[PDB]
Structure 1
Amino acid sequence: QRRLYDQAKAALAKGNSAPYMASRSALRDYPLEPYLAYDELTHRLKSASNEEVERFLTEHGDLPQIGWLKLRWLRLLADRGDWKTFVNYYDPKLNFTELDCLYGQYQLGHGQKAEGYATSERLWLVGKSQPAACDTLFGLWQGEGQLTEEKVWKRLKLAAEARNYSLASHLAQRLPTLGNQGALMVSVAQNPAQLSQTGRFSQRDHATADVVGLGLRRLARQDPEKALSLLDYYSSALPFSSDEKVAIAREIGLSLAKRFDPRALPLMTQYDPGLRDNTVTEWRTRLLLRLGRWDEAYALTRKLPQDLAATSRWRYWQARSLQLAQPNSKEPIALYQKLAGERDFYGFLAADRLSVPYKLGNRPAHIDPRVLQRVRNAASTRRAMEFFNRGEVINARREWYHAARLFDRDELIAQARLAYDMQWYFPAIRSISQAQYWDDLDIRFPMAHRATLVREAKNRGLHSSWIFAITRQQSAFMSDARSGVGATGLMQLMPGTAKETSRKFGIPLASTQQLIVPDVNIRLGAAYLSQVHSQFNGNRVLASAAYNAGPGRVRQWLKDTRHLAFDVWIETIPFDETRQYVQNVLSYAVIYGQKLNAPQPIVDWHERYFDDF
């Protein structure tokens, strides 16, 4: 018989356990019964035995919520001094700092001082406020004289580095000697342009170098031309260590390079000759490409340490910097050939650079039906399916991922095909992508909301593939999706942009929680898409960037250009978030162009050269 278990579900959070106990003889089969038992135990947790919690931890250890029980239970264990049972279940990979610190306490009270000192110092040297357990640990750690001036100074630095100046200030007011330079650090950290006053910061001690160094690093981010000028002064004037000095040059160099300033080149060149910092290594090359310096760019691309030389990026830019530098040479067509077989952005360029067609190569992986049935007979699946069939997506979704925590490369691919078959495309994309079987393109690039999208493309004169590309990149088809600063929907329409876009074009919205609707979200998103499309002369390369980065930023990234190669421009976008965003959308469009029977090339004829001239 089937069971309306909600009755028991209502009872527990909040209230009593009576209906659950009543129904527990029936629900022994049902896969969601463990969620009730869980909630049952948790509401009476402080009273329950070890043996009972341990019995539950074993037999329902697979549940998503189980780490919270571990946390709640371990708190108690420690708060009674039941440390034997504590260390039996303490696990750093739960990533609760409260526990880490409690395990820190345990160490100090059980002989393990080397382990506790290093455990304490690891949790100390961290520039955010840590949980109230860690106070107790830093207390014991302090009590054994380990909390020296040096280390309180170092956490002060990390705090100011993170802009958490309340913690920074608190710590500066715990510096027996360096009370001054510590306060002076927070002032520089807050306004690094203060270092214009070279007399007021020229006291040749190791702590004063520490503040100017922090200052110069932050100042670089927003006024790099000033930090470069001030670095020439402070280097002679102060006791900068060798590696204190390089991390200043890094910041300035990267900051100058993102503004296409050639004075980055001599700095980066001297201060990281070995190519030990991959980001400098990447941006020196990027900058050479922007400045049109192909001969030099090509030289950097041979020096790359293998893990960069490996990437399909620098494989391309070795072939292309060469070709720009030596136009008549044939050596590049060899290298493009090696690379043109891949199914990524730089791969498509390589194929586009040889005039030969793209290599998509859809071929679903070799699957075992023992593996498919084993994963369907895992309880997590049966649970997640049950949440989906009931219609609580957040639950069903949560189960899928916490099961995907420890499936091997064979097993993850089973999940993906199980999900794709249920018209549930986002878990299918997520599961397959963590399995890394890239070649399944019916799962990775599905034809979701195709009714809505194909129509809304023609509505506003935009190739269908470009909308599929943008949506797939922005949400991976997750009808209700949200970001770390709060963009809403399939086309990640921003709260700000959401309302205005509606008014200006001629369709009416309702709210924040009306951008979950597909036919809403997709309609006004496609409007804003065409707005920028037109804003930049139907150039998807620029417009796609604008959709993510803002037209204002994209205009900024065109001062003052002249016949810029499209591929150089994409590479020389200062933001890493935006560069990758653009490369995906372009490449996704190629894939969707195929699947919608309408060949999109990576770049259109008129997208290839552009400027603000």
Structure 2
Amino acid sequence: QRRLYDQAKAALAKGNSAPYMASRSALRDYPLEPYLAYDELTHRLKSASNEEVERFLTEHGDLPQIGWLKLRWLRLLADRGDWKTFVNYYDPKLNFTELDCLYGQYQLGHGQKAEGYATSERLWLVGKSQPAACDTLFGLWQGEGQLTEEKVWKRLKLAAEARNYSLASHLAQRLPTLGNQGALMVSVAQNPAQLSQTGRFSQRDHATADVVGLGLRRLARQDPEKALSLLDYYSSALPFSSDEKVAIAREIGLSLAKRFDPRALPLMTQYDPGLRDNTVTEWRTRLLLRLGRWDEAYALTRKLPQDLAATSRWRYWQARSLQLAQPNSKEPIALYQKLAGERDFYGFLAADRLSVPYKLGNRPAHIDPRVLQRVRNAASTRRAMEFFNRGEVINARREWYHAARLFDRDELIAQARLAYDMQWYFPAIRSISQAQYWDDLDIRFPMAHRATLVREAKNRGLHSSWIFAITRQQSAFMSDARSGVGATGLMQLMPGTAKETSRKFGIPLASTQQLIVPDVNIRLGAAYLSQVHSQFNGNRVLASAAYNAGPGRVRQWLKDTRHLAFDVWIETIPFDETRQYVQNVLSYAVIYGQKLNAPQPIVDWHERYFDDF
């Protein structure tokens, strides 16, 4: 039959187990029955026996919420001093700092001193505030005389780095000999430009060097030119260790290179000649490409480490820099011919340089029926299926993620294909990605919200494929998505932008929370897109970047240009997030172009060169 288990849930959920105790024998085969049992045990967890709880963990360890039960339970096992049990069930994989600090207490109180010190030190050297259970441990660690001044100093430095200045100041009051430099470190961390007063920061010890070194690295991100001047002076004045200088030189050079200041070049060259830091090497190469120094850029691409030379990026720029440096040479055609085979942004470029068609290569994955069956029959799967039919998107989704956290590659692809056949596109995308089966382009790029997406594209004179690419890149079709700072829905609209586009384009919006509705999200997403499309004379490359990073940043990154090529511009975008985003949207728009039978080249003719000139 089918189960009225909401009676048992509603009574449990704030209340009594009587309807659950009545109904359980009916519910034995019902897959969500272990959510009620969980809740029922959790309410009376304090009075429950070890043996009942242990038995529950053995029978339902697969449940997504089992970690919370272990956190709640292991607290009690420590307050009771029942450490024999605690250590049988303590799991560092749960990533609960409370349980790690309690395990630290255990280690110290049961002969594992060295191990307990290491545990304490690892939980201490963290620039944020830790749980109340860790003050207990930190006290015992201190009380065995391990909390030296060097260890408190090192945490202060990490807390100034984290910008947790209440913590950083608290730690400054706990330095006996070094309280002067500690207060200096909190002052410098908050305003690093104070390092202009070189007389005030010339006391020649290793503690002052730490405070100045932090200051210069933070100063580099806002004002690299001031830090450059001050580096010269401070490296004579103070006892910076060898690696403390290269860390400072790194931040200054990286910051200067993203402003396209060539004074980054000699600094980067001197402080990392071995090309140890990949980021320094990439930006050293990116800067040369921006300055039009292709001979140098090519030279550099030969010298790269294995893991950078491996990638399609630097295979492409090796060929392309050589093509720019030596227009008559025939090495570039051989190098592009490896790469045009790849279904990739840089593979699409290499193809486009040869003037040959892109190789998408939609090869769907070969699945064993026994593996598909095993995955479909699995309890975690059957529970998720049930949540989806009931109309709990989020519960079903959670079951899916947590199950896949320990499924092998075959099992993951099976999980992908089952979710695709339910027209549940984001989990299918997600599952196939953790498998890293890239060639199944049916599952990876579905036509999710086709009718709506094509309609709103035609309204604003934008290509269908470009909007499909954006929403695929921004949400992967998860219609209730939410970023770190609250960009919402299929096209990741910002509350401020959403509200502004609602008033301007006459599209009705109820709430910030109404951005979950696909038609609402697509309407005033495609509106903003056409607004920035128009702002940059219909240049998808620029317009794309403007969408993700804000038109004023794109204008910034176009400053003082003249006949700048599109591939160079994309490569030298200062933000890592925005650069990948642009490379993805253009690539996805190629793929969606084929799938809409409206072929899209990687870039249009009028997008290939641009300036603010």
TM-score of Structure 1 vs Structure 2, range by shorter chain: over 0.9
1:386-406, Cα deviation, whole Å (9 max, x unpaired): 000000001000000000100
Correspondence 1:334-373 to 2 at 5 A: 334-373=334-373
Q: Counterparts of 1:176 and 1:513 in 2: how far apart (Å)?
A: 51
1:509 shift after superposition? 1.9
Q: Counterparts of 1:374 and 1:251 in 2: how far apart (Å)?
A: 51
1:112 shift after superposition? 1.0
1:57-79, Cα deviation, whole Å (9 max, x unpaired): 01010000000001111111111
Q: Counterparts of 1:315 and 1:368 in 2: how far apart (Å)?
A: 36
Where 2:354 maps in the other structure, the secondary structure is: coil
Where 2:107 maps in the other structure, the secondary structure is: helix
Aligned to 1:554: 554
Aligned to 2:405: 405
1:510 shift after superposition? 1.8
Q: Counterparts of 1:64 and 1:610 in 2: how far apart (Å)?
A: 51
Aligned to 1:184: 184
Q: Counterparts of 1:167 and 1:201 in 2: how far apart (Å)?
A: 23
1:192-238, Cα deviation, whole Å (9 max, x unpaired): 00000001111111111111111001000100000010000000000
Q: Counterparts of 1:61 and 1:94 in 2: how far apart (Å)?
A: 13
1:513 shift after superposition? 2.0
Correspondence 1:132-147 to 2 at 5 A: 132-147=132-147
Where 1:177 maps in the other structure, the secondary structure is: coil
1:523 shift after superposition? 1.0
Q: Counterparts of 1:510 and 1:191 in 2: how far apart (Å)?
A: 41
Percentage of pairs with the same residue: 100
1:307-353, Cα deviation, whole Å (9 max, x unpaired): 11111111111111111111111001101000111111011001001
1:398-426, Cα deviation, whole Å (9 max, x unpaired): 00000010000000000000000001000
1:48 shift after superposition? 0.5
1:508 shift after superposition? 2.1
Where 2:200 maps in the other structure, the secondary structure is: coil
1:57-107, Cα deviation, whole Å (9 max, x unpaired): 010100000000011111111111111111111111111111111111111
Long gaps (5+) in structure 2: none
1:278 shift after superposition? 0.8
Which deviates the most, 11-20 or 24-33? Answer: 11-20
1:300 shift after superposition? 1.2
Q: Counterparts of 1:105 and 1:250 in 2: how far apart (Å)?
A: 40
User: After TM superposition, what 4+ stretches of structure 1 lie above 4 angstroms from structure 2?
Assistant: none
1:528-577, Cα deviation, whole Å (9 max, x unpaired): 10000000000000000000000010000001101111001001000000
Aligned to 1:262: 262
Q: Counterparts of 1:18 and 1:232 in 2: how far apart (Å)?
A: 76
Aligned to 1:385: 385
Aligned to 2:505: 505
1:452-503, Cα deviation, whole Å (9 max, x unpaired): 1111111111110000000000000011111110011111111000011122
1:570-604, Cα deviation, whole Å (9 max, x unpaired): 01000000000000000000000000000000000
Q: Counterparts of 1:4 and 1:275 in 2: how far apart (Å)?
A: 65
Where 1:199 maps in the other structure, the secondary structure is: helix
Q: Counterparts of 1:24 and 1:348 in 2: how far apart (Å)?
A: 58
Where 1:135 maps in the other structure, the secondary structure is: helix
Q: Counterparts of 1:580 and 1:333 in 2: how far apart (Å)?
A: 26
Where 1:515 maps in the other structure, the secondary structure is: helix
Q: Counterparts of 1:489 and 1:14 in 2: how far apart (Å)?
A: 32
Aligned to 1:443: 443
Correspondence 1:573-588 to 2 at 5 A: 573-588=573-588
Q: Counterparts of 1:322 and 1:94 in 2: how far apart (Å)?
A: 50
1:415-449, Cα deviation, whole Å (9 max, x unpaired): 00000000100000000001000000000000011
Where 1:3 maps in the other structure, the secondary structure is: coil
RMSD: 0.7
Where 1:482 maps in the other structure, the secondary structure is: coil
Correspondence 1:484-563 to 2 at 5 A: 484-563=484-563
1:372 shift after superposition? 0.4
Aligned to 1:461: 461
Where 1:24 maps in the other structure, the secondary structure is: helix
1:15-45, Cα deviation, whole Å (9 max, x unpaired): 1111100001110000000000000000111
Where 2:25 maps in the other structure, the secondary structure is: coil
Q: How many residues align?
A: 613
1:169 shift after superposition? 0.2
1:506 shift after superposition? 2.7
Q: Counterparts of 1:133 and 1:560 in 2: how far apart (Å)?
A: 56
Long gaps (5+) in structure 1: none
1:350-383, Cα deviation, whole Å (9 max, x unpaired): 1001101101000111110100000001001100
Where 1:489 maps in the other structure, the secondary structure is: coil
Q: Counterparts of 2:16 and 2:10 in 1: how far apart (Å)?
A: 9
Where 1:353 maps in the other structure, the secondary structure is: helix
Q: Counterparts of 2:2 and 2:190 in 1: how far apart (Å)?
A: 63
Where 1:25 maps in the other structure, the secondary structure is: helix
1:507 shift after superposition? 2.3
Q: Counterparts of 1:344 and 1:84 in 2: how far apart (Å)?
A: 54
Q: Counterparts of 1:311 and 1:11 in 2: how far apart (Å)?
A: 57
Aligned to 1:238: 238
